[PDB]
Amino acid sequence: GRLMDRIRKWYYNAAGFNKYGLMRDDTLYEDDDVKEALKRLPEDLYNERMFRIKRALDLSLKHRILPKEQWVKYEEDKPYLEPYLKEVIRERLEREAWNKK
Amino acid sequence: VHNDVTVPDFSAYRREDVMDATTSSQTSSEDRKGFSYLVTATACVATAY
């Protein structure tokens, strides 16, 4: 049924990164794979990500959040980095596999 | 030009076994090194002691 979907939507809202206007992908820890993926983002997607983050850090220092009407909605969260990230990890594993003789 | 350049003569310094230009220096290499390394290993022994 819609159990998994129900759960995911609950968590999304429970997590709360959307109160800062951040997309799920804006919250990823920048390990090696993520760093490489970021470098592949198109100019505009990259500049938009940057603004959202700079803006959230501002909210964080002010100890405020966005007005409830600007919170990102679970179904409008754009997974802008996931596609790239997947390719990156896919490539890395290939190299890794291939370098094992 | 570089053609007019030659390595000076180091006979006043060469170890006895590599003094002769027409003799392979590889045959005395293990002795030349074994000796120097012996001194070192010995110092390590004295030091460890």
Binding site: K39, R40, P42, E91, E94, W98 | -
Partner: protein
Amino acid sequence: CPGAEDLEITKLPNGLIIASLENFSPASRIGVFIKAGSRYETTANLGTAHLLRLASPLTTKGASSFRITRGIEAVGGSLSVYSTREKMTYCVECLRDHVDTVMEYLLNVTTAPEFRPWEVTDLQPQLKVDKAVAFQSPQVGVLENLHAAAYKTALANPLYCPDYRIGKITSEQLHHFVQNNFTSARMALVGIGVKHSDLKQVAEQFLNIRSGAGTSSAKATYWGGEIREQNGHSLVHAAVVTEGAAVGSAEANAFSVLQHVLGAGPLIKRGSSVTSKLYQGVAKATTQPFDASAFNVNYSDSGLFGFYTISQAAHAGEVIRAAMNQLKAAAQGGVTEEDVTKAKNQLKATYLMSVETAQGLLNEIGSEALLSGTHTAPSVVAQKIDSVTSADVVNAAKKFVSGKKSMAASGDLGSTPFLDEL
């Protein structure tokens, strides 16, 4: 226990030509010939062909950038791309037992490129480097200017991406180029050390970018300009040409012979070229080191003919004028009937040696199998060459002295004469 063999050559319905040959050599050398080049670029996408050439190792729909390089190296293979203003060749070499392996890559590269934006951005600074090493030979620089003075369009475009465009070429531009030029009817899949049934099979079952003649290139319009690059070098390189013959143009061989009659490169190490009208003539004029040769290029719809010199700055004047007289003098019957005999030897020899190396052979086969899906017998070619009268040659020589000329010179041009003083 292998022996002789045939030079087969099918030609599928879509127009894709397939020429193979089995010489039982332990090494195979397949290639994809294509009618593409800076010739098809326009002001808007200048240099896109150059970059496309360097883009061969980028990821494709079938292989990743990493696997293309690792895969080929895995079996001691190689992958390279040579190109002229009007043709591009993608070839791979490797030991016989690996033709399958190496094939997948050659295929992917020419028909399934992904031109990922990031990969492309990263590669563009290479154009500067590539171009930098190429330009170390003065030769390359004046030949660029030469074509820019010779034509107003198509063949006028440089073979190396102009500076203002390094970093500005886009992925869409690379895709559009490959889509409008790498069409089945402008490509030829030539192979050596392989079996036709095999090579033929690979083509039809794998080559998908489809048919058409794609975007056709504009006609080459002659200009007859003059470009002078004053850069202070002690030596002055200069080339003077005239519209010569086109590929296949009957008047071709005539120039080829007039070329060898005038002087087409040295034959003896550190030796003088006596059989060289042009060299010998220039030699008599100046005392200092120099070099003169008959320049000759044949393109699809045009060609260029003339002489290329290299000389000290102060003697550039006399050296170039001396080269001119040797051309007039030749235009005025000053061509022995024996000269034409010798030249026909050097020409038959040269052509024959050209095909000794795998690279030269594959290129011979492919080039023709591309511009006419056929193959002239080394006898018919010889037959066509020697059947060139001394008249023909003297005529070619005339067409030069009478036709409009274009010149290009670089170095300390302080004493280099202008085209209108020749």
